[PDB]
Amino acid sequence: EDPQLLVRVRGGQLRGIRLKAPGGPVSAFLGIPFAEPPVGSRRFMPPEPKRPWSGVLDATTFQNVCYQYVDTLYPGFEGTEMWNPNRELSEDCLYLNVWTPYPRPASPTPVLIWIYGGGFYSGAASLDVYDGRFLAQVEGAVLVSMNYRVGTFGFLALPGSREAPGNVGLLDQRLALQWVQENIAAFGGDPMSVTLFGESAGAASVGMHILSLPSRSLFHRAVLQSGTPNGPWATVSAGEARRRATLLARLVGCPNDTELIACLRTRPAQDLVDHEWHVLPQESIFRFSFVPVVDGDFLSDTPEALINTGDFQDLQVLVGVVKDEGSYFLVYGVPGFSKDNESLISRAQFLAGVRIGVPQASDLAAEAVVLHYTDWLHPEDPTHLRDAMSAVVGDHNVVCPVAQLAGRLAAQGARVYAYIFEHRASTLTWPLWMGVPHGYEIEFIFGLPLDPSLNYTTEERIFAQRLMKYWTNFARTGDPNDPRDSKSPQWPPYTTAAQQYVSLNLKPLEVRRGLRAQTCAFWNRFLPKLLSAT
Amino acid sequence: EGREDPQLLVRVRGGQLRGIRLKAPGGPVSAFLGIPFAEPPVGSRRFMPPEPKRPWSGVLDATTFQNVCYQYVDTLYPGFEGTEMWNPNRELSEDCLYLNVWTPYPRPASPTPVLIWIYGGGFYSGAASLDVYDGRFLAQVEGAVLVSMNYRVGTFGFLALPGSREAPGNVGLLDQRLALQWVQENIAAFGGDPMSVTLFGESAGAASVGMHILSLPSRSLFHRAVLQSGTPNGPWATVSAGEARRRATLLARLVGCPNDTELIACLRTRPAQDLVDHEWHVLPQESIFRFSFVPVVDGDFLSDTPEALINTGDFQDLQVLVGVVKDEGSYFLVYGVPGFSKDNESLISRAQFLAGVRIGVPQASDLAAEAVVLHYTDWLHPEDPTHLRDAMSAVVGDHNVVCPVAQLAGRLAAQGARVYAYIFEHRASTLTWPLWMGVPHGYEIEFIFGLPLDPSLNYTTEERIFAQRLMKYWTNFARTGDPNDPRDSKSPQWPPYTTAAQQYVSLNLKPLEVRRGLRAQTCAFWNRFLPKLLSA
Numbered sequence A: 001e002d003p004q005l006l007v008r009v010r011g012g013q014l015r016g017i018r019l020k021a022p023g024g025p026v027s028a029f030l031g032i033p034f035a036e037p038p039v040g041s042r043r044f045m046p047p048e049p050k051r052p053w054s055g056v057l058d059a060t061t062f063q064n065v066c067y068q069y070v071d072t073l074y075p076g077f078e079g080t081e082m083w084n085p086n087r088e089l090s091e092d093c094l095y096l097n098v099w100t101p102y103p104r105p106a107s108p109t110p111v112l113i114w115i116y117g118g119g120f121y122s123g124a125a126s127l128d129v130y131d132g133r134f135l136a137q138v139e140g141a142v143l144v145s146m147n148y149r150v151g152t153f154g155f156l157a158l159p160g161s162r163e164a165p166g167n168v169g170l171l172d173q174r175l176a177l178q179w180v181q182e183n184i185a186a187f188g189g190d191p192m193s194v195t196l197f198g199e200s201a202g203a204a205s206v207g208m209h210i211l212s213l214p215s216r217s218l219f220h221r222a223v224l225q226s227g228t229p230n231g232p233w234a235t236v237s238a239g240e241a242r243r244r245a246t247l248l249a250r251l252v253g254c255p256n257d258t259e260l261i262a263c264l265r266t267r268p269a270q271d272l273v274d275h276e277w278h279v280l281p282q283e284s285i286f287r288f289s290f291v292p293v294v295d296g297d298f299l300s301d302t303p304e305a306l307i308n309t310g311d312f313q314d315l316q317v318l319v320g321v322v323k324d325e326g327s328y329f330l331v332y333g334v335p336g337f338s339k340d341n342e343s344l345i346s347r348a349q350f351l352a353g354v355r356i357g358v359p360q361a362s363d364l365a366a367e368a369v370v371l372h373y374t375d376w377l378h379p380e381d382p383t384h385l386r387d388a389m390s391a392v393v394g395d396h397n398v399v400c401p402v403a404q405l406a407g408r409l410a411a412q413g414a415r416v417y418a419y420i421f422e423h424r425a426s427t428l429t430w431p432l433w434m435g436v437p438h439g440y441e442i443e444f445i446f447g448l449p450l451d452p453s454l455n456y457t458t459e460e461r462i463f464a465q466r467l468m469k470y471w472t473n474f475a476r477t478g479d480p481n482d483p484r485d486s487k488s489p490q491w492p493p494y495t496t497a498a499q500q501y502v503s504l505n506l507k508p509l510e511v512r513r514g515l516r517a518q519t520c521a522f523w524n525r526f527l528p529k530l531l532s533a534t
Numbered sequence B: 001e002g003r004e005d006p007q008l009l010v011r012v013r014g015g016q017l018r019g020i021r022l023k024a025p026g027g028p029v030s031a032f033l034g035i036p037f038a039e040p041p042v043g044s045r046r047f048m049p050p051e052p053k054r055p056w057s058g059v060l061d062a063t064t065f066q067n068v069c070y071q072y073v074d075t076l077y078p079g080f081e082g083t084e085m086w087n088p089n090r091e092l093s094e095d096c097l098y099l100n101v102w103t104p105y106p107r108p109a110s111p112t113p114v115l116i117w118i119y120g121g122g123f124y125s126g127a128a129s130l131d132v133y134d135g136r137f138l139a140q141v142e143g144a145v146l147v148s149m150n151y152r153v154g155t156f157g158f159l160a161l162p163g164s165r166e167a168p169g170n171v172g173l174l175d176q177r178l179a180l181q182w183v184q185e186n187i188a189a190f191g192g193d194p195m196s197v198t199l200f201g202e203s204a205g206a207a208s209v210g211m212h213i214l215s216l217p218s219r220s221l222f223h224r225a226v227l228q229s230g231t232p233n234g235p236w237a238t239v240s241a242g243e244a245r246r247r248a249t250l251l252a253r254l255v256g257c258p259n260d261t262e263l264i265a266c267l268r269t270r271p272a273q274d275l276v277d278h279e280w281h282v283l284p285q286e287s288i289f290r291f292s293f294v295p296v297v298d299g300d301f302l303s304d305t306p307e308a309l310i311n312t313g314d315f316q317d318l319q320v321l322v323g324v325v326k327d328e329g330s331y332f333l334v335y336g337v338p339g340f341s342k343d344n345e346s347l348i349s350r351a352q353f354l355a356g357v358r359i360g361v362p363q364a365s366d367l368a369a370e371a372v373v374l375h376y377t378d379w380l381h382p383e384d385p386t387h388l389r390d391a392m393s394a395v396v397g398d399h400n401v402v403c404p405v406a407q408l409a410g411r412l413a414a415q416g417a418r419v420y421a422y423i424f425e426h427r428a429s430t431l432t433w434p435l436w437m438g439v440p441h442g443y444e445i446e447f448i449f450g451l452p453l454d455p456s457l458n459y460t461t462e463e464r465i466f467a468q469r470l471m472k473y474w475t476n477f478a479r480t481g482d483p484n485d486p487r488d489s490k491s492p493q494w495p496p497y498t499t500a501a502q503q504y505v506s507l508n509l510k511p512l513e514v515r516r517g518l519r520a521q522t523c524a525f526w527n528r529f530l531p532k533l534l535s536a
């Protein structure tokens, strides 16, 4: 045995495993259950806390991945496989993971809680890019990551019903957060300093915890990477959720809510996943079938209303985007795009792409988008049109929604820091035209380049160390700047006045002003006004 | 005759004329001023098409400028050179259809290309006798034969009751056309080549030139054209027959008048000054860069809207030179946008900006106005007074001149014409308007005409060299349809404007510089998006 790998939490004893990190050992407690398996009659229902266990629970291996659709667009392709489940799929998946320095910290250490992305229909805390050993070893951080239900299992809703209230996947995350308040101290973590961070749907999830009162007492700071609670894809109305739920029911042979849900519960998991994608209202990209719902409960109102009228006085937030938020999504549905060629498109393909990229847009609105992104000096140039289609998708779904959030949070009392990540991993396997795709800053924040066997450049390894510092400094103090180091340059807070943000790349920090200011004014101020009349 | 300068006696279709020998910096020039080309359009001729001037007896004296067409006189800034320089400099009268001719002295031995100037003034003012349109420099230095004509403005030249016989509209344009025919028939007597006539004009004059390009009967009277800061298409150069009818009958009511015959007959009994006194009271909304009586789409002179005509016209054998000045809109702001004055910096608030936009784009809906505001707002400093002031200027300039010009250059180029484009960026050292206005509408004219060559005018030496360059460009273009000088490979060339490369040059003290895209993004907003917003 080894007293450093043995811990006692409210539900019982656990035994972790000593793991090897480039510069030393780390303690890892993997696959800890935080809820009763949400199986059988518990499908679609809120999670219940895990009942106490006897003996020493083995926490040396990752638990199962929540049941979800598996990507098959590019079989054998590293670029896609790296996001696919790396453990058995099962509805019994509510487990979390903890990494801590070895030996366990002498004094309470700030805690970082990761919430993965995957459009609310996929993902898992066991993926290699979320490996928390690096942050634990190098920065002495206590890192936690939980699995939460996705797809229909976590978000199918029949608003108002008792058996399928919606947002249970968000409640899974919340329960994991409560578990941290109650047990993290046993691992040397400071429950009084918990920072949530996540990417994409994970970022939107973090945003939702910021906007839901019951979550606010479970964390202190937040980081949203390439994702927000507001925006066109992160939420749906109660009406739209009901529509999709009943439509999915129909597609699988079911059928009063109770009856419908009861029948949905008798169906095999893969049956539900098989039809998940057939409930989307129009042909589109960056749209997901089962996502959080404005239930008037977890979310008292739309994220839009909540961020416009919220008081964020004592909150510190770090937000940012990658250089090419939209490239990735284009190959999943826009005619003319592929990872295998340059994807130089025609102007016609561009107008077609926009209708798919902004599925909710009227013809006039679509026209405005086209006229705004067309480069009138080279209106027919294939390369510009291709890069413009990427920008439309990235701006509409991430950048502008992020600019919007940064602005409201800053205007309403929060301390905000913003960035744009611009370094493309030397090991990226997607084509060059995609630039720095959605999700590729993660491996750097988690510190993977510090693993010699991964073949990153020496520069990349120094870069990752910088980023890890920023994130952990932010977790420690609510300020990413190094408290002691007297000449940086400094990363200034983001404000509505100066709108300052920094570029994260191999070069030293560079301060810039206005995050796609003109273009986001188009998306955030004009387009809305357009559709509410037309 | 007997003792007179034999070089100043000339005969034209209507009779004998005696000109005057004038002095130009580098030598003498011949000037024939105040030649009548039409019967005085007075009394029962008011509002009617011009009739050719009947022959006269004896030697008509053509040594001084004739009357200025009856028009509104600006008094916004009494005593101010900036405004006075455009005011009438001869007696006002409805008897005003006269033209002027400048030629080298002695008159050219072989046929010389002819340049015909058509003045601007929003179709409500102007005169060919203003100092900035003095043709002596172009005649003396480039050996050009320059002609300029007065044409009726305001109600006298554009009030129309479409379909009627007594006030068909566009008579001011017909006055111009009659002067062009007069040139075809008589310019040879002065040594001008009737087979090489280039029309050039600025603002309403440029719009006029554009309308001659779009009206078949005028096409046989000229060969090349220059449009400076103006176009026949755009929001101010024309009105629909319905709108002209409305304005004319409203003006009729305002002066006590009331069937078209009755109305027009009553209008003809009214004193000229009474018509001018109510001219401005017929505009549909509060606005700037909008004029009461302008060319009407009558389905005659203009068979269709200038927009339709430039989109479907064949401009195969046409060479055109077009351009704008650096700050087309500044000037207009002081005539109606609250917060703007020539006497202070005109730093404005964001609220004043939104209000200025409603006045500057008077025909825009609330949604359209918001679109303009959102497009011109600098979101990094949305409240900065200086940027707002400069943005208000840009809105007015782009909507009324720059984008309409870009639209025109594009259609002409795509449809067979040879087009050359420029942006004039030099501010006269002698300008009396405040610095914030930059290079205002109309201030490139004194340079094209060569005034800086006159020592007494106090222009800098560089300005004088600049003027000489411009005169060369314009006359080269008039001679060959190409502004470039064949005997000179050093000076960078001025490339034609094409839909593909969209090249145009900057005209300033520096040597020519080629640029691409004339306000391409912003004009796409005005020319492609705003309209579509309108179709809903």
Ligand SMILES: C[N+](C)(C)CCCCCCCCCC[n+]1c(-c2ccccc2)c2cc(N)ccc2c2ccc(N)cc21
Pocket: A274, A275, A277, A278, A279, A280, A281, A282, A283, A284, A285, A332, A333
């Ligand atoms: C009116 N009505 C609803 C009847 C028809 C209207 C068409 C709207 C649906 C389009 C959804 C966007 C394409 C996504 N899309 C589809 C799909 C869904 C419906 C139609 C065509 C394709 C897909 C389908 C299956 N079975 C399995 C995997 C995938 C898939 C996987 C990943 C991903 N990112 C997108 C995907």
Ligand SMILES: C[N+](C)(C)CCCCCCCCCC[n+]1c(-c2ccccc2)c2cc(N)ccc2c2ccc(N)cc21
Pocket: B277, B280, B281, B282, B283, B284, B285, B286, B287, B288, B335, B336
């Ligand atoms: C529907 N209803 C008729 C009841 C109201 C609509 C009237 C709005 C018209 C505003 C015209 C823009 C200001 C021009 N504007 C006006 C004027 C016209 C109407 C109302 C207020 C001012 C002016 C007035 C007089 N008497 C004499 C000279 C000038 C003037 C002179 C030069 C210039 N460039 C512009 C000028």
Ligand SMILES: *[C@@H]1O[C@H](CO[C@@H]2O[C@@H](C)[C@@H](O)[C@@H](O)[C@@H]2O)[C@@H](O)[C@H](O)[C@H]1NC(C)=O
Pocket: B338, B339, B340, B341, B343, B344, B345, B346, B347
């Ligand atoms: C600039 O001027 C605008 C127009 O006001 C006129 O000019 C000023 C200088 C005074 O002489 C006044 O009597 C005139 O009516 C003003 O509306 C504007 O506020 C002025 N700008 C500022 C803020 O100084």
Ligand SMILES: *[C@@H]1O[C@H](CO)[C@@H](O)[C@H](O)[C@H]1NC(C)=O
Pocket: A335, A336, A337, A338, A340, A341, A342, A343, A344
């Ligand atoms: C790229 O491949 C896609 C599908 O494989 C195809 O539709 C498109 O035309 C190709 N583009 C190029 C660069 O040829």
Ligand SMILES: *[C@@H]1O[C@H](CO)[C@@H](O)[C@H](O)[C@H]1NC(C)=O
Pocket: B456, B457, B458
């Ligand atoms: C030109 O300058 C002279 C010398 O100062 C002055 O007497 C004259 O009035 C000026 N004339 C002009 C055009 O301003």
Ligand SMILES: [Cl-]
Pocket: B289, B335
């Ligand atoms: Cl005016």
Ligand SMILES: [Cl-]
Pocket: B076, B335
């Ligand atoms: Cl006025």
